[PDB]
Structure 1
Amino acid sequence: YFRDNGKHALIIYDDLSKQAVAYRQMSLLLRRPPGREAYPGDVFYLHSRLLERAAKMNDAFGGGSLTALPVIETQAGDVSAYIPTNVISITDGQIFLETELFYKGIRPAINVGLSVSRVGSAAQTRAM
C-alpha cells in the first residue's frame, strides 16, 4: 500500500523459517507429497513470490519503495540447509550473525567476512 503511493515502507519477516514450517504442516495435512526434509516442493516459490514484492519504483509509479528484512534461523550454523539456501539465493545480500562472534564480545555479532550487500555503495551517503 505504501509502496504504491509514493511512500517508503520497511517490512521485517521474523522469521521465515517458522512460516516454512507452517506451510509444511498445511501441505502434509493436505496430503501433498513431501520433499526435502518433508518440506513441500514449492517452498522456494513460497519465499520468492514473497520477497520479490519488495521493490523500488520509478517516478511514473510514484517513486515509493518497500524494503524487506527477512530473518532466518539456522541450526548449529548450518547455512547449507534447505530453507537457508533458498532464502540466501533469493535476497539481495545477507547479514550473517555468529555465536562465536557474539560471545567474544563482538555485539552486534555481524560476520563482516560473509555479510554482503549486493547493492553496496550505490545506496550510501557520500560521507559514509
Structure 2
Amino acid sequence: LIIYDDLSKQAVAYRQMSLLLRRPPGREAYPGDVFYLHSRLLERAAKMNDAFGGGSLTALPVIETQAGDVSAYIPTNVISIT
C-alpha cells in the first residue's frame, strides 16, 4: 500500500521543472500532460492475477483542494484516475 502525500505538491514541483525546461504551460500554468503525470503513476498500483504472482499494489494518493472546490481542474483530474 503506497501513499502519495500529497500529489498536488508534486504537480507544483513538476510545473517548476517543465517551465524551467522552457516547455510551454497549459491550463493553470501546469504542463499539458499534468493528467498523464498521475495517471502513469497510479496505473502501476494494481491487482495481479495468480498466473503473475497473486500480489497487489494499493494506492491512496492525497490531493489538497483550495476553499473546498473538488470540482476544480486538478482535483477532478485525479478523481478521474483513481
Bucket of the pairwise TM-score, normalised by the shorter protein: over 0.9
In the TM superposition, residue 38 of structure 1 has moved relative to its aligned partner by 0.1
Q: Which runs of 4+ in 1 moved over 2 A?
A: none
Output one character per residue of 1:41-65: Cα deviation in whole Å (capped at 9) or x when no partner: 0010000000000111000111000
Higher fraction of helix: 2
Of 78-87 and 19-28, deviating more is 78-87
| TM-score normalised per structure 2 | 0.97
Aligned length: 82
In the TM superposition, residue 16 of structure 1 has moved relative to its aligned partner by 0.1
Of 40-49 and 76-85, deviating more is 76-85
Instruction: Identify which of structures 1 and 2 has the higher relative contact order when contacts are C-alpha pairs closer than 8 Å and 6+ apart.
Output: 2
Output one character per residue of 1:8-61: Cα deviation in whole Å (capped at 9) or x when no partner: xx0000000000000000011111111111000001000000000011100011
In the TM superposition, residue 83 of structure 1 has moved relative to its aligned partner by 1.2
In the TM superposition, residue 80 of structure 1 has moved relative to its aligned partner by 1.7
In the TM superposition, residue 76 of structure 1 has moved relative to its aligned partner by 0.2
* Identical-pair percentage: 100
Higher fraction of strand: 1
Q: Find the aligned partners of 1:44 and 1:74 in 2 and give their Cα distance.
A: 16
**Secondary structure of the equivalent of 1:44?**
helix
Structure 1, unmatched stretches of 5+, are 1-9, 92-128
**Secondary structure of the equivalent of 1:69?**
strand
Q: Find the aligned partners of 1:16 and 1:62 in 2 and give their Cα distance.
A: 29
| TM-score normalised per structure 1 | 0.63
Q: Residues 43-122 of structure 1 correspond to what in structure 2 (within 5 A)?
A: 43-91=34-82
In the TM superposition, residue 82 of structure 1 has moved relative to its aligned partner by 1.7
**Secondary structure of the equivalent of 1:55?**
coil
